[PDB]
Amino acid sequence: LSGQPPKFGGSTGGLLSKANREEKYAITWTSASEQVFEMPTGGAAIMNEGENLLYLARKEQCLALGTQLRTKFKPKIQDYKIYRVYPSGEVQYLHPADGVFPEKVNEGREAQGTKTRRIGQNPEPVTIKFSGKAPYEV
Amino acid sequence: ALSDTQILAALVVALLPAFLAFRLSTELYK
Amino acid sequence: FGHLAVVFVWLSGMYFHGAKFSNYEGWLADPTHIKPSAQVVWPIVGQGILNGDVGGGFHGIQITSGLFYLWRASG
Amino acid sequence: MDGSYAASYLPWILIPMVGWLFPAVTMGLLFIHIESE
Amino acid sequence: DFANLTPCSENPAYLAKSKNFLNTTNDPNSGKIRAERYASALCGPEGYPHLIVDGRFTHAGDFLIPSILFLYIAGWIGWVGRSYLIEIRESKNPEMQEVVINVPLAIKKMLGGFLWPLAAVGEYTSGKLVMKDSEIPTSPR
Amino acid sequence: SHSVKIYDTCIGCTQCVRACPLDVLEMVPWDGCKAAQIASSPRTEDCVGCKRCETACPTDFLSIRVYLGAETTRSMGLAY
Amino acid sequence: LNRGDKVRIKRTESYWYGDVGTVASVEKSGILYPVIVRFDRVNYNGFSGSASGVNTNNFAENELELVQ
Amino acid sequence: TKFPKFSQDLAQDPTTRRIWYGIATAHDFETHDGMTEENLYQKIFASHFGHIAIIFLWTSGTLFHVAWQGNFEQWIKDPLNIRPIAHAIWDPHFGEGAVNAFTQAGASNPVNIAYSGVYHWFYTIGMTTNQELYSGAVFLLVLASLFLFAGWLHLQPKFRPSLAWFKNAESRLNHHLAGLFGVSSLAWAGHLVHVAIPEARGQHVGWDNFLSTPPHPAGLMPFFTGNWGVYAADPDTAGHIFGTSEGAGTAILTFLGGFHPQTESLWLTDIAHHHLAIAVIFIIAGHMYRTNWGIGHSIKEILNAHKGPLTGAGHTNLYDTINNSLHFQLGLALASLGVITSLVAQHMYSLPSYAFIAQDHTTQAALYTHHQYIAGFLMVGAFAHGAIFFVRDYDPVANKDNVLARMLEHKEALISHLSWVSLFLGFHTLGLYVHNDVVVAFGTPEKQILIEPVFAQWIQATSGKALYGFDVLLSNPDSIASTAWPNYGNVWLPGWLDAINSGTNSLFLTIGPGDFLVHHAIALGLHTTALILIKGALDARGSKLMPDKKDFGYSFPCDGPGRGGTCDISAWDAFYLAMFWMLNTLGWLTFYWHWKHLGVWSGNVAQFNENSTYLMGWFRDYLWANSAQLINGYNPYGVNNLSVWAWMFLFGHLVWATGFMFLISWRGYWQELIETIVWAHERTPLANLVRWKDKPVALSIVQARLVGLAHFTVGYVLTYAAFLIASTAGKFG
Amino acid sequence: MDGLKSFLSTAPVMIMALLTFTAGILIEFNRFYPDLLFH
Ligand code: CLA
Ligand code: CLA
Ligand code: CLA
Ligand SMILES: CC1=C(/C=C/C(C)=C/C=C/C(C)=C/C=C/C=C(C)/C=C/C=C(C)/C=C/C2=C(C)CCCC2(C)C)C(C)(C)CCC1
Ligand code: SF4
Ligand code: SF4
Ligand code: SF4
Question: Where are the transmembrane segments (chain B)?
Fold first, then answer.
């Protein structure tokens, strides 16, 4: 979790008590040029030279920040890493879970969440009655 | 009219559906 | 500019209705008994009943905008 | 609220209980219950 | 039959109202000709003419004549719109011609509606009026 | 958590995996289409249920389905 | 099936179920749904307020019924 | 975490959604965890026992409060003059004005006037003292106790029935048709001939002289020998006074077929003979289905043998479809119960069977409106469970090419035809109403489209109403129907013709041009409610917008903003919309009934007959004119007895507009609003101490659709109950 | 000028011309033969 924080003046939009009781999310990106971005918490901040460490409370805020880092800057910042840090202390590593962004085929990922049929051959709820399951997951 | 003690008799009789309703609802909760 | 053209068309309609289809020439003489009426109704399906007796022998809808008071104040 | 009928003291005690003791006790027990564990 | 309704000629209430019918048009005899027109109808104790929609031909003008007239001049509208919509479906851009109406074609179709019931029985006997149940798109069933 | 299922009709157009805000989805190799790729849903415990992945899917009816279920902290989007 | 062929959909899922469509291509690379049928009618697709959907889908060989 | 113990997926979210959805899902026993079909059926059975005890405790409370706090002793002296007291008001909020205003119907305490009509029902069935009602209330307490013990007993593993017991349709049909519908009707005929008819003729038949006093001077030997005419020897003479012996007659079973000329209701002997006939027919109908012995029918044979050419498979495999599905059974039960609740409402006002209930007008209005609202709710629930059956329990493989498969195989055709008929009928009812309204407003009421409802007038003429001048079947006494030439068995016909042709009773009301348009409005409401309900029932398995809705279930919120926007696509949302249309249609018909009977009761029927043909007539002669006595229930001068009804009027308006809040504003606005409020709580001093265990979230989409529907319904019912009960009690007692 | 031809041929202009024409003939028939409740 190395990195000086952005020069932000503080805001009421941000980390509530969820951050220090359960998980909060850190986005770390490196930029050569100092510039101004829109924090998803509301406002505008200062990208430090080099590494940045921004603590946010939702994963969607971190990915929205990373999205605007990718698309709203002409020198696109694509070496951004999103962590999930716990108050107990351990740090997870979430968004670029493999090497490359999810749009690109890494060829070493596993096809999970894939059904071997289309929606027409989905089973129907009358067959699975009182089975504790639901027509997708059978 | 109606008596004073008939009302209390009805109350102590209706104490029996109270007990049986409590036990039926408890047994439905299983 | 096109919107101003619309507003001037509407305002011309107001002044033309006060000119031709109104009892302003009659209301100006007696503005305490008879009432303004800047819109007569063509009788087609029995809607000539909306031409209620507004005063002075004129028959029409009594208007509720202060156009007649506006034109009396403006001279 | 005079009571001409038999046992006029009985609504006198049962309107507070069904109005307060039944709601306060029932919502207290349900508040302990729905938030237990 | 119909003892509840008396004809408006021999009715006290209708005479009481018809003394004061209003003028619907500029004409000052419109109320009088309306009172003469409604005197042949059947009206109740209220003094307002009632309509009889049995299909009995003594009261065929109450409902059946407007029934036939509307059915003709609305089958006109339906058939003309159907024929125009069928026609524009072979013009390589059938969707724009709903926006901008092809007025020579539209007026030709609109004056084609004189013979719609003959066109309707012709298209129904020759199978162009309806479509088969399989040939049309449908929901999952 | 919501379950995101991807069916055989996927054409590997990548639209769902970049329409997803939380980047639940990712593209894995496949042999059943011209694009030689199919969407998968590995981190599907992070799905909020927004269904922007279903909105972006061009195949008819749908090659990706979101099936809303047991809510959690991650799948309800609560900052508190 | 060949290019330009009009086919009738029997998918039971598609918006164009029972509707006719000109075949735009057939793929030979051994994929599950190789026939690209493209329709005059657009489906239910896109975000809300979008002026149009998509008129193209990939169907298998068995789902199509040739009507030309 | 522990509260929704029936579903583990709800005991995990740390929000208030688990509280709301635990309360909602608690009775959907099919979706609980660890539920097999046998445990489903046994839990359902004991829930039924608990509900039977609810009904018995409710009627025990009604009896106990008529007995204890009501003036039943005083009311059976002169039921025409004294208002029946329901129970006693005891709240500490009443000022002096409200206590003096609510002291009514000859009491000392403040009391509530009973508009449920239980007084007339108890007086008719022979109850004439407070001790009889107290004994009835204690007996129903014991009966409710018995059914609670029965439910607890059938949750015990020794007495829990098997699945083959619950899936035994033929034996249940036998014992319900014969032993429940026929033996109970026979027992009611027994009570009528032993207790209600004799105490209507004067003598006391309690439990003591029950065996000592035969109902008839002739014994039961005439019943056995076949000489049954002695039971109809001398009927109640037309100068009979209820509750005492003047021209009694001593005939327990007669069939006069008119009205009692003093109570204005039906003769109790006629009621007893009716229930005897119904018991005989229902008892022989309960010997139709096969059981442990050999004779009878098997329902599978009856259903599977009905196969025609125009349907194909016909009814094959409908026995297992109905038997294995509980939502099909519940839909059929609710449909039949809604039909017969409509029937109860339509017959209890035109053919009243209680002493002096046709002369107490507020209770007749309350009973009609109550049962028509229950009937609308039950019909909408029948279609809701048709939709739930089509989602959950419908198997399109076993139901191949039968009548259900062919329902779903052409649902677009009949949905489009319901669309056409509702559009057609609505366009022209609103067109005729707006035409009448505009031409009346233009000073020319003679230009109205006034259509004689000749078909219903002809129906009344066939039943004997000779006012309209038709002489067809019973209005023509020379006809084959009126004479009944082979036998002349029309014993009911002189009394029926004397009752239908009297202008006093509500039996076969005079129907004019104002009734035509409201019947077509009622037909429009029925058709549009049916359109929404069958559009949810048949599209429950999916339309082209969403070809899979069976996998999302019944009450999913939406399917996203994709595919154009998919806001109310679930079948539950068609329930929602048809709930609105049901409330509208019942409002239309109860408005119509109420205004028609305010004309009839007051004698000024001309008000309805000329002013109901246009909409401002409905608006100024009904809504505005009759709420004058309502809103003046409390004014700055003082308070009268219609003050709680004025307060309920305003209360129902407030609940209705809160329903508007839930239906119009949607969840995103409220979720971000609650996020700001949560920030406020977590960042303020002295309230940081108090923390929520369940994180506050906004109500869900489907949940707040339901909450707005509940508010709309509750406010709608409370407003109309207040208006209908204060408008009649404003001008009729 | 083919643009005024294609604009006067649009759906709103043609539907308003049609509604104005039908309203005109209905209003004229009510002006000459005023009150026709039946035949
Ligand atoms: C349905 C039940 C019901 C009942 C019976 C009451 C009854 C009462 N209300 Mg209330 N009210 C209710 C519902 C009810 N309300 C609801 C739902 C609303 C919200 C819309 C209100 C709104 C309302 C307001 C805003 C006010 C009242 C007030 C009053 C009281 C007027 C007299 C007074 O000064 O009391 C005094 C208070 C009491 C008698 C409360 C009981 C406290 C004493 C100390 C008894 C406790 C004894 C002991 C300490 C504990 C014994 C334990 C036991 C096991 C033995 C009266 C007792 C007024 C008042 O003065 O309230 C305080 C008033 O200002 N009410
Ligand atoms: C001319 C085209 C056309 C024709 C032949 C039909 C014919 C049909 N429609 Mg209709 N319909 C159309 C236009 C058309 N419609 C349009 C434009 C609308 C959109 C509002 C609808 C919406 C509609 C509904 C919602 C329903 C029907 C239904 C029906 C059937 C019963 C007739 C009826 O209820 O009329 C009803 C007609 C209307 C409510 C609106 C008619 C609109 C105008 C008057 C028609 C002419 C349109 C256009 C100006 C013609 C172009 C002329 C050409 C020179 C360019 C019938 C198959 C019903 C059904 O399901 O049948 C079982 C039904 O429920 N239609
Ligand atoms: C002769 C024997 C008999 C009898 C009397 C009953 C009686 C009953 N059974 Mg049972 N049952 C039987 C044998 C019997 N069963 C057998 C052998 C089977 C096994 C195959 C079952 C299996 C079965 C199950 C599985 C269930 C029942 C249920 C019930 C109840 C349904 C009736 C009810 O609640 O509304 C009472 C209804 C009536 C009295 C008649 C209906 C009303 C009609 C429409 C007339 C309308 C009223 C009239 C117009 C005027 C009334 C107005 C007046 C009140 C003011 C009732 C207690 C259900 C229940 O409640 O469980 C506890 C239940 O779930 N039974
Ligand atoms: C369950 C279910 C369902 C159903 C439901 C519903 C749909 C209901 C409705 C139904 C109904 C609700 C019906 C009604 C009925 C009616 C009728 C049944 C009528 C008729 C009647 C009669 C026949 C009568 C006659 C007569 C007269 C009128 C006079 C005198 C003589 C006589 C008696 C003959 C569904 C399918 C959804 C789905 C599945 C499930
Ligand atoms: S958007 Fe649909 S078609 Fe495209 S890659 Fe994702 S699942 Fe496949
Ligand atoms: S529902 Fe939303 S968050 Fe979940 S996979 Fe689809 S696009 Fe991503
Ligand atoms: S507005 Fe609400 S109900 Fe409609 S599509 Fe969006 S989320 Fe679903």
Answer: 5-24
